[PDB]
Amino acid sequence: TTALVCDNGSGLVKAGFAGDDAPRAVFPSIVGRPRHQGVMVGMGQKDSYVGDEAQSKRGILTLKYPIEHGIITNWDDMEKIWHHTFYNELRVAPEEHPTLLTEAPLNPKANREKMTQIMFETFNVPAMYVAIQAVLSLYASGRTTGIVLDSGDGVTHNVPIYEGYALPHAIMRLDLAGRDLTDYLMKILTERGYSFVTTAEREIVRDIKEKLCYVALDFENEMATAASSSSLEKSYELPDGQVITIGNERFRCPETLFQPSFIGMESAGIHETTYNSIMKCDIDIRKDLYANNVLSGGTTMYPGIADRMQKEITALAPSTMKIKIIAPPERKYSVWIGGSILASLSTFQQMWISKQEYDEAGPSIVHRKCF
Amino acid sequence: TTALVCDNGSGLVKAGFAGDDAPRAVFPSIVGRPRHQGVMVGMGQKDSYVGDEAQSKRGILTLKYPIEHGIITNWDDMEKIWHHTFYNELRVAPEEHPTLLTEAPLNPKANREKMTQIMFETFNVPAMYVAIQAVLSLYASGRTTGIVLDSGDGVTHNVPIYEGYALPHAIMRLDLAGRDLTDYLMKILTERGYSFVTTAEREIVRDIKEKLCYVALDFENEMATAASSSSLEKSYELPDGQVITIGNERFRCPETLFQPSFIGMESAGIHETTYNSIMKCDIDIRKDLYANNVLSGGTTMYPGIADRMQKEITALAPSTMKIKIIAPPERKYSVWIGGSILASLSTFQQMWISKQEYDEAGPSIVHRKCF
Amino acid sequence: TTALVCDNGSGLVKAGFAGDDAPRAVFPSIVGRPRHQGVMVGMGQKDSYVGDEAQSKRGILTLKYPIEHGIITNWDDMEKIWHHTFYNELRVAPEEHPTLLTEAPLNPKANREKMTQIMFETFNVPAMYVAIQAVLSLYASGRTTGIVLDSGDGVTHNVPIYEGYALPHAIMRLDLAGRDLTDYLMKILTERGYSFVTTAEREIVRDIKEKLCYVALDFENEMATAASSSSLEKSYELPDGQVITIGNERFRCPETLFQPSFIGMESAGIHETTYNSIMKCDIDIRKDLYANNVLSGGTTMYPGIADRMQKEITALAPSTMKIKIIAPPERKYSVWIGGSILASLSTFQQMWISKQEYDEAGPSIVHRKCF
Amino acid sequence: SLQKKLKGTEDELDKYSEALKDAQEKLELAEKKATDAEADVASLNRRIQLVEEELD
C-alpha cells in the first residue's frame, strides 16, 4: 500500500503520495462563504467553497484561513479542507491509506491530539503520524546535520540538528511570516493612495508581494537609491486594470524579517535568531552548523535573501569560519519532499500509529516516542 | 606466535604487538553515549561510541572514563574498550595471542583479579601477565638501576630499582596527575571569563594544556614577569572560533605538581616524593639513584619539567653528588616500549599465566610469584 | 559613620545601612528604554527608566538586565542602577559612606576590578569591600561551619566552610538559576496554548512562577497524579483578565534544578553537586557538613525544596548520618543580613580598602589581602 | 541581441572564479606557513631564554 503526505502548512495545502518527486495538489488553505444575498432562483449555489474554487469566486465570498500560526482555530473549516483534499484533488479513499501529517515545533498539544482524533474517527485512516517540518526539510536537503530555518506562512522556526540528533533546548520559534509581511505591505501601500481592505484584496496584495518584492543587500543604500533614482520602481496590473506603481516598498516589505520592529514586534531578525540558536548549541558542533545553514519554506523565496542572510551571519560569527547558506530552487516544497522520502523509508513502517494502538490508548498516544 | 602489549593506562589506550618499536593503536580511553533524543528515522545510530570516534561525536555524547586513578570503576565500559582495541584497531583474534597488561603499584587486588578473569573468560586469551608500569619504563630506558617517576594521567609513582631489585617499602604513589591538572586549569581559566563545564569541553581544555602549558624554572620570578610584561601571553583558537588568550596560567597549571596545595592536597610535590623515596632507600645505593632519575609518562612532557626537577632535587640532596634526570623524547610511550621488550624476551616465555594454570587455581593465581 | 550594604545580586538590588535588620530598598535590577516613538509634545519623557519605576511602564519599554550570570555585561546601565540606588532609593551621598558589595565565587577578576574602579572614581566612596555571598549567608544563619547552597537568579553555588575556614577546592558553581527556570516555564507553557515572548511578558511569567510553582517530593508520582486527577490545576489572572490554568507545569518547572537535562545541560542536580562538594572535603568534617546544610537565595523559596533536597541527600549519603537542611523563612535576604552583620563588626573596620590605598596600588588591590 | 552580453558576463565570471580560487589557495598556504614558522620561533625563543638562565 501507499501512504499519503499532507503538508498542511498555514496558507497552502500540499498533498500527494509517498514516493513522488513533488505534490500533485497545491491549493490555498482557504474556505469562502458568500456574503451577498443571491437572487437567481435555480442557481442552486453551494454554501461554502474550499481551496482553489474560492479564489475564483473571491469577489463574492469572505475568505477565512482555518490556521492562524501553525495552530488550527476552526476545526470545522479544517475538516472541510481535508475532505476536499482527499476526495476532490487526490480522489482517494482515506480508509486505505496511511497519512503523514506535518506540524511546527512548539505548538499546543491539543492541536496534535485533535488532529489525530479527526484522522481516525472522521476519515478513518488505518495509520497516521505527525512529523516536524524542519526534520523533513533536512531529509529533502540531503544533509544529516545543519540548522534549518523553515519560514512558512504562519510561523518561522530554527531547528538545529547534528548527526540526526535534534537539540530541543535550542529550537527557536518566531510568529513572523508571510501573512505578517502581507499585512505590512497592505499597510504601507497606502502611502501612495492604493487601498486594499477587503479579505479578497489581501490575495491581490499577496500576489504583488510574490511577484515584485525582494530583499535588499544593504537597506540604507537601497533607501538612498530609491530616494534619488527611479530605476527600481516597477508596475503591476490589478484584476480591474488601473496599474499601480511600487517604489521603495519593494524591499521594505521583506525587510521586516530582519527588522521585526517595523511591525512593532520586540524580537530579533531571522539572521539573529539563527545565530542565537547556534550559540545556544554546543561548542564543538557550531562549525558544522555554520557550514550547513538550510533554508526552506515559501517566505525564503525572495530574491537576495540568501545573500543577505549570509552577509548578516558572517558579520555576526567569528571571522575564521566558512558560513554557507543552502537555498535550493525547490525550497517551497522541501517539507513535502522530505515527508515523501520519510514515509517511503522501509524503516519507517514501524513508526506509524496504527488504529488499534489508538483505540486502546486514546489520542494521548501521539506524544509518545512517536513525537 | 606473537604477544600483544596493551598499556591501558588511565586516559589513553596504547596497544600493539610484542617486538615493535611503538604502539600501532593510540586512542583515548573514553566511552560516549548520546544525550539528546534523535529525530531522523533510518539513521540507525549506535548506543555507545568508543575511542577515537567519541572524540569526533563529542558535541552529542557524554564522555566517561572507565578508569579513575589506575583503578577501573566501570567494568562494562572497560570491556567495551578492550573489545574495540582487539577487533577494530588491531584486527586480531585474542584467542591466539598472549596478552601483557600493565598496572600501577599499590592498586586494589580485585582490580588485577577481575582483569585476569575478564581476559580469560570473555576474550579467551591463551596466556596473560600483569606488569608494573615503572619496571617496564626502566626496561625501555636501557638502565637496570634508577628511580623512575611515572606520571601518567591517573596516578604518579616513584619506584626505586637497584641492580634489578625493587625496594617495595620505598615505593611512593600520589593521586595527582594530568586529570587533576586539567581540572585545575578549567577552574583557573574562569578568572578571564572563559567557562568550560561540559564533559566535552574538558577535552578542549586538555588540548589547551598540552599545547600551551610549561613549567617555570622559578615560580615567583615568572609570576612577576607575567604581572609586568605581556611577552609570555599566548593565544588559542577554539573549535568555534573566538580565540582565547592565556596569561600566567600557562605555568600555574603544571606548578600544581610541585605545589599540590594549589588543589587543596596535603602531600608534597613530585620533586619531594622522589627525594623521600631516595632517602627511604639504603645509604649505599643513593648515589646511583641520584644519578639515574628516570622520567616517563605523559604528564612529564611539559617544557622545563626536567630542568625544574633537577634544580629542586639538587637543592634538596647533599652538595657533593651529581644529580641527573633522564627524560627521553619518547617518554609518553616508555611503558609500552618496555612492555614490548619484556614480552619479546625469550626468558619471559615461562612467566606467562597459562590458561590451564588459571582453570585449576582460580583468579588468585595472579598474585603469586608472577606479581 | 555608617556603612552601606548593597547586595546587587542579579535580578534584585537589595540595599540598606549596616546595622539594620533588613534591606531598606529592594527593587529589580532592570533598565528600561522606550521602543515606540512618542507623539505627545510636552510629555518631556526621559530616555531610560531604572528599577521599580520601569516595571510600571513595562508595556512601553524594553527591559534589559545589566547582570547576566553574576557577571556584569553592561557597565553604563550598571552605573545607572547604582546611581538610582544611592540617590533615589536611599537618598545618601556616597562620599561619606563606606560601601560593602557582594559577588559570587569563581567570577572573572575584571568584574571586581571595574566594580572598585567605579565605586572609587564615579561615586568617590571613602572605602569599599567585596564579599562572597555564601560567607555572608553563613554569618546571617548564625553557624560557623556548614555547606551553604546559595541559589540566586543568575548563579547557584556551594561553598563548604568548616570552623571558619573555607575549602576553595570544593567550591562548586552552577549556571542554572531562577532566570533559566523562568525561560523553561515560558517554553513549557506554550504546549498548553499560552505564548509569552516579550521581555515584558517574561516578568509576568516570573510572577506566575513565584506564586504557583512548587517542588514535588516524588516526580513520577506527581506526574501520574496530574495525568489522572485534576486537583493540581490552579488558575492565574493575567494583567488584562484572561485567566490561565496550569497543571503539570507547576512542578515541572523547578524540577529543572534536580534534572538539569530538562534545559539541555550536562551537569547534575543541586542535590548531587551538594553531595559532591561534601565528598571533595576532608573525611573528618563531613559529619558537620551533612548536619549543617544551609539554603539561601530566592530560588530556594519553592515550597517543598527542603524536603526534596533532604530526601535526595539522605538517599546519597551513608545510612549512619543525620542530614539536616536549614531553610529559614527570611531565606532570600540572608546574604544582605549577613552583609550588614559583617560590616557592623568592630573587628572589620580595618579590613576595608581605603581611598589612598587604592590611589597608590591601583585597582589590582582588590584581589590582595584586602580581599 | 543581448545574448552576447550574457555570454561575455559568463566568461568574465568564470575568470573571476578561477582567480578567487587561486587566491584562496595561496592565502591558506602562506597562512599555514606563517603559523608554523611562528610556532617554531616561539618554541626556540623560550628555549633560548632557558639556556640563558642556564648560562647565568
Ligand SMILES: Nc1ncnc2c1ncn2[C@@H]1O[C@H](COP(=O)(O)OP(=O)(O)O)[C@@H](O)[C@H]1O
Ligand atoms: N516567490 C515568493 N516570494 C515571496 N514570498 C512568497 C513567494 N512564494 C510564496 N511566498 C509566500 O509564502 C507563503 C506560503 O508559504 P508556504 O511554504 O506555502 O507555507 P505554508 O505551506 O505553511 O503556507 C505565502 O504567504 C506567500 O506570501
Ligand SMILES: Nc1ncnc2c1ncn2[C@@H]1O[C@H](COP(=O)(O)OP(=O)(O)O)[C@@H](O)[C@H]1O
Ligand atoms: N605535551 C604534553 N604536555 C603536557 N601534558 C601532556 C602532554 N601530552 C600528554 N599530556 C597529558 O598526559 C596525559 C596522558 O598521559 P599518558 O602517558 O597517556 O597516561 P595514561 O596512558 O595512563 O593515560 C593526558 O591527560 C595529557 O593531559
Ligand SMILES: Nc1ncnc2c1ncn2[C@@H]1O[C@H](COP(=O)(O)OP(=O)(O)O)[C@@H](O)[C@H]1O
Ligand atoms: N517565592 C518564590 N518562589 C520561587 N522563586 C522565587 C520566589 N521569590 C523569588 N524567586 C526567584 O528568585 C530570583 C531572585 O532571587 P534573588 O535572591 O533576588 O537573587 P538576586 O539577588 O541575585 O537576584 C527571581 O528570579 C525569582 O524568580
